[PDB]
Write a protein that binds this ligand. Structure first.
Ligand SMILES: CCCCCCCCCCCCO[C@@H]1O[C@H](CO)[C@@H](O[C@H]2O[C@H](CO)[C@@H](O)[C@H](O)[C@H]2O)[C@H](O)[C@H]1O
Length: 488
C-alpha cells in the first residue's frame, strides 16, 4: 500500500463512476466508484490524498467528458493534438475540486470513523460539488444522483432534489466503505436502512393528471448537418424541410415544436416568412414553438445578440415585441461569450426569471440546451400553473458519442423533481417525451430526419422540491457539516 499504487486505483475507480450514467445506466458503479474514492483516502496526509482525489476525478472526467474533443472537430478547426490537451486541462480543472474534497477531508478527519464517512463526507461532497458548479459559470456534470433516475433512490429526488441523492449515495457508500475496510458488520446494515428508507418513496404520485386537456404534440428533428448548419444560403432548404414536414401536421396537432437555432437567421430578417406562417397555423388551429437568433436593438442603440425561443399560431399570436418568448440566461462558457476580465459578436445574457410560455391554452417553462442541468434555475422559472416542461438543444457536436446520453439522463431528473411532462426537441440528439417520473413515453433514434408525434396529459401538482429547493439538503448539509467540523 504505497502512494504510487493508490493513484492508479483511484484512476480506475474514477472511470468506474462513468458507467453509472447513460447509456450504461449501471447505478451500482456509482456506489462502487464512491466506495473506491472514499476508501483510498484512509490514513493519509492531505497533500498525498489530494493526489488520489486528483487522479480519481481525472479517471471520472477523463472518461465521461472526452466527447468534447469531437465538439472542436467542427468548431475552431484545430490541428488535433491541441484539443487533447484541453480535455486534460478541463479534466484537471474539474479534478481540482475532486482533489479539494480529498484534501480537506484528510485534514479535519484523518481518523477512519463512521462520523467521517456518514456525516462529514456527504456534507462536504455537497459543498465541493456546488463550488464546481459555481466557480466561473459552473459545470456540474456527472453527479451520481442522476444515475438513480432508473434506480431505487428515485423516490428521494422529488423531496430534496438530485443533489440530495449525491448526499445519501455518499452516505450509504460511506458506511459501505467503512464495513469493507474495518470489516465491521454494523455500518453495512446501517448503510442499507439509510439506502432502503427512500425506496418506498418512489410509489408516491405527487402530481395529478388532467386527462381532459390531452393534446397531440408533434416535434420535428430536421437532421441538418453541423458542417452545413450555419452556412450562408442553403437555409432555403431548411425552411422547405420543416414546412413540408410541418404542414401536414398543422391541422390536427395542438402544439408543434422545433429545436434550438432551427432558423439559421436573425429573427428580424425572416419577417415575411413568419407573418405568412403564423396566419396559416391559426387557420389550421395549432401552435408552433421554435428557436431562433435575435439581434435586438437596445435602448442605447446597440445590438444584444440573444439565443431566443418564439411562439406562433393559435393561442400565441406572433409579434416582434411579444412577451411570449424566452431568452437564454446561463450562456455556454466559451461557445458564445468570454467570461474573463478581457481577451488574452458576443451573445448577451437573458433574465434569470422569465414567465412561462403560452400556446393554445398551454403553459410551458423553457430551458435552452445546457440550462436543463441546472435544477435550481429550472425550479425558479417553474410556476404552479405550468402545463409541461420544455427543453430544446443542438447536440450536433458530440456526434456518435456518449455525451448526449449523459445530457439526456440529467434532463429526465428535472421532470422527476417537478412532476411535469418534459418535452425535449433536438437537432440530432435524444429527442423524447419524458413523463412526470422520468419514464420515457416515446423516443426516436439519432441521426435521422423524423417527426415525433404522441399524446400527453398535463399535471398540476407541487413537489417538495418545487415548494422548497436544494436548501433542505443544505440544512442537512449544514447540520452534518456544523456538527462534524466542530469535533476537530
Ligand atoms: C461504432 C459505435 C461505437 C463507438 C465507440 C466509441 C468508443 C466507445 C465509447 C468510449 C467513450 C467515448 O469514445 C469516444 O467515441 C468517439 C465517437 O465515436 C470516438 O471519437 C473519434 O471518432 C469520431 C467518429 O465516431 C470522430 O468524429 C472523433 O473526432 C474521434 O475522436 C472515440 O472513440 C472517443 O472519443
Amino acid at each position: 500500500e504505497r502512494q504510487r499504487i493508490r493513484l492508479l486505483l483511484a484512476l480506475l475507480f474514477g472511470a468506474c463512476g462513468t458507467l453509472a450514467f447513460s447509456p450504461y445506466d449501471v447505478w451500482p458503479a456509482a456506489i462502487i466508484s464512491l466506495m473506491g474514492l472514499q476508501a483510498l483516502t484512509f490514513n493519509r496526509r492531505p497533500l498525498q490524498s489530494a493526489a488520489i482525489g486528483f487522479c480519481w476525478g481525472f479517471g471520472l472526467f477523463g472518461s465521461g467528458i472526452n466527447w468534447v474533443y469531437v465538439s472542436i472537430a467542427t468548431f475552431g478547426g484545430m490541428p488535433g493534438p491541441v484539443n487533447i490537451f484541453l480535455v486534460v486541462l478541463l479534466a484537471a480543472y474539474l479534478s481540482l475540486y475532486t482533489g479539494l474534497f480529498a484534501g480537506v477531508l484528510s485534514r479535519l478527519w484523518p481518523k477512519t470513523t463512521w462520523l467521517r464517512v456518514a456525516i462529514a463526507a456527504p456534507a462536504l461532497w455537497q459543498v465541493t460539488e456546488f463550488l464546481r458548479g459555481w466557480v466561473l459559470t459552473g459545470f456540474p456534470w456527472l453527479q451520481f444522483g442522476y444515475s438513480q433516475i432508473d434506480g431505487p433512490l428515485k423516490g428521494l429526488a422529488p423531496i430534496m432534489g438530485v443533489e440530495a441523492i449525491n448526499f445519501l449515495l455518499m452516505m450509504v457508500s460511506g458506511l459501505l466503505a467503512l464495513a469493507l475496510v474495518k470489516r465491521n458488520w454494523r455500518p453495512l446494515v446501517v448503510a442499507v436502512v439509510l439506502f432502503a428508507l427512500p425506496f418506498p418513496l418512489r410509489y408516491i404520485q405527487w402530481f395529478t393528471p388532467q386527462p381532459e386537456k390531452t393534446i397531440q404534440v408533434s416535434m420535428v428533428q430536421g437532421d441538418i448537418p453541423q458542417s452545413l448548419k450555419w452556412d450562408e444560403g442553403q437555409l432555403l432548404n431548411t425552411l422547405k424541410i420543416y414546412y413540408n414536414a410541418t404542414a401536414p401536421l398543422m391541422g390536427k396537432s395542438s402544439l408543434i415544436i422545433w429545436p434550438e437555432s432551427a432558423i439559421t437567421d436573425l429573427e428580424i430578417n425572416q419577417q415575411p416568412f413568419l407573418k405568412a406562417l403564423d396566419g396559416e397555423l391559426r387557420d389550421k388551429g395549432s401552435s408552433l414553438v421554435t428557436g431562433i437568433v435575435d439581434a435586438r436593438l437596445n435602448k442605447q442603440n446597440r445590438y444584444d445578440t440573444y439565443n431566443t425561443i418564439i411562439t406562433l399560431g393559435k393561442g400565441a399570436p406572433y409579434s416582434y415585441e411579444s412577451a411570449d418568448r424566452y431568452n437564454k440566461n446561463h450562456l455556454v462558457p466559451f461557445g458564445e461569450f468570454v467570461p474573463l476580465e478581457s481577451i488574452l459578436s458576443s451573445f448577451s445574457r437573458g433574465p434569470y426569471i422569465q414567465p412561462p410560455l403560452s400556446a393554445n391554452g398551454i403553459e410551458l417553462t423553457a430551458a435552452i440546451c445546457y440550462e436543463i442541468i441546472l435544477g435550481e434555475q429550472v425550479r425558479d422559472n417553474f410556476r404552479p400553473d405550468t402545463d409541461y416542461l420544455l427543453t430544446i438543444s443542438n447536440d450536433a457536436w458530440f456526434g456518435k458519442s456518449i455525451g448526449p446520453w449523459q445530457h439526456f439522463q440529467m434532463a429526465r431528473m428535472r421532470a422527476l423533481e417537478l412532476a411535469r411532462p418534459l418535452l425535449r426537441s433536438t437537432n440530432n440528439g435524444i429527442t423524447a417525451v419524458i413523463g412526470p417520473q422520468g419514464e420515457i413515453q416515446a423516443m426516436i433514434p439519432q441521426f435521422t430526419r423524423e417527426v415525433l408525434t404522441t399524446n400527453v396529459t398535463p399535471t398540476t401538482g407541487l413537489t417538495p422540491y418545487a415548494r422548497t429547493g436544494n436548501w433542505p439538503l443544505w440544512v442537512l448539509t449544514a447540520l452534518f457539516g456544523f456538527a462534524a467540523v466542530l469535533m476537530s
